[PDB]
Design an enzyme around this catalytic site. Structure first.
Site, PDB file in Angstrom:
ATOM      1  N   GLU A   1      -2.236  -8.970   2.727  1.00 21.88           N
ATOM      2  CA  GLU A   1      -1.779 -10.195   3.373  1.00 21.88           C
ATOM      3  C   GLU A   1      -2.798 -11.463   3.077  1.00 21.88           C
ATOM      4  OE1 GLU A   1       1.263 -10.501   4.204  1.00 21.88           O
ATOM      5  OE2 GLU A   1       1.852  -8.619   5.464  1.00 21.88           O
TER       6      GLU A   1
ATOM      7  N   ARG B   1      -1.957 -12.591  -0.428  1.00 15.10           N
ATOM      8  CA  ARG B   1      -0.726 -13.348  -0.467  1.00 15.10           C
ATOM      9  C   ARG B   1      -0.933 -14.708   0.026  1.00 15.10           C
ATOM     10  NH1 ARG B   1       2.107  -8.121   2.097  1.00 15.10           N
ATOM     11  NH2 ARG B   1       3.584  -7.261   0.435  1.00 15.10           N
TER      12      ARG B   1
ATOM     13  N   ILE C   1       0.762  -1.056  -0.101  1.00 11.79           N
ATOM     14  CA  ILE C   1       0.052   0.041  -0.186  1.00 11.79           C
ATOM     15  C   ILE C   1       0.959   1.203  -0.140  1.00 11.79           C
ATOM     16  CG2 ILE C   1      -1.610   1.274   1.282  1.00 11.79           C
ATOM     17  CD1 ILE C   1      -3.059  -1.388   2.100  1.00 11.79           C
TER      18      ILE C   1
END
Ligand SMILES: *[C@@H]1O[C@H](CO)[C@@H](O)[C@H](O)[C@H]1NC(C)=O
Length: 246
Positions: free
Chosen positions: A160, A163, A71
């Site tokens: 996250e 991912r 970000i």
């Protein structure tokens, strides 16, 4: 762009958003069947915009670097906000130029610095869809201390989760009740770069890691990942950081 609305959100709609997020990141290769993010991308195409809407329908737009899922900053009403780091200053040359003012936050975007600013580690910050709705709302009006905590939530629930399938599932478990992240969650976050590297080094090493990666598992026990037959590799990680960026 990708979009996510907290109004009427449930595990399925959050799943569709995390799927769209992953699908918006460009890659030309897979490594052990996992998308390998690009080494670099020039110009405005480096950045993905996520439109996030809180329960009342107010929105922020978040800019994400497609090469590492970091970000960079966000726009809320006519104000842009960017981390205090060179990568975000660079992004400010390409996104949200239309903002009436630009505020640089008094920290960079890394976990350590954000936890200092927020006054707490992310072991103590609940996450989930309600926490995400709160974070969007906090970010609508500048308060740098409150923003730090909100950005820890936002990073965890977007990047996250993109991912790692495990983290996406954790958020789906927390669709209607926030809970602090599991240690497993923290461990994976902290290991993304290391795993991404060792999966890549495994390619000419018979699927064996050069250096083991230590993780905490879903039961609280620390374990070693030594090769690509591990579930983490086969059934969890969804995106690899290019070793060019490690
Ligand atoms: C590879 O990883 C698995 C654990 O997922 C383990 O049982 C096995 O012993 C490892 N083999 C090597 C050669 O590192």
């Amino acid at each position: 762009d990708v979009s996510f609305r907290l109004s009427g959100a449930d595990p399925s709609s959050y799943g569709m958003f995390i799927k769209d997020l992953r699908n918006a990141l460009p890659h030309t290769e897979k490594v052990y069947n996992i998308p390998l993010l690009l080494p670099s991308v020039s110009g405005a195409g480096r950045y993905l915009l996520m439109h996030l809407f809180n329960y009342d329908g107010n929105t922020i737009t978040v800019a994400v670097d497609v090469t590492n899922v970091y970000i960079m900053g966000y726009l809320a009403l006519t104000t842009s906000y960017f981390f205090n780091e060179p990568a975000a200053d660079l992004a400010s040359q390409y996104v949200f130029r239309s903002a009436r003012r630009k505020i640089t936050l008094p920290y960079s975007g890394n976990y350590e610095r954000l936890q200092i600013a927020a006054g707490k580690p992310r072991e103590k910050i609940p996450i989930g869809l309600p926490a995400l709705d709160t974070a969007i709302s906090t970010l609508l009006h500048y308060d740098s201390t409150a923003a730090a905590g909100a950005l820890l939530v936002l990073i965890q629930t977007t990047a996250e989760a993109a991912r790692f399938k495990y983290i996406e599932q954790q958020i789906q478990e927390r669709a209607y009740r926030d809970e602090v992240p599991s240690s497993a969650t923290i461990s994976l976050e902290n290991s993304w770069s290391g795993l991404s590297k060792q999966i890549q080094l495994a390619q000419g090493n018979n699927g064996v890691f050069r250096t083991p990666t230590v993780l905490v598992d879903s039961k609280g026990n620390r374990v070693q990942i030594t090769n690509v037959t591990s579930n983490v590799v086969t059934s969890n990680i969804q995106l690899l950081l290019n070793t060019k960026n490690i």
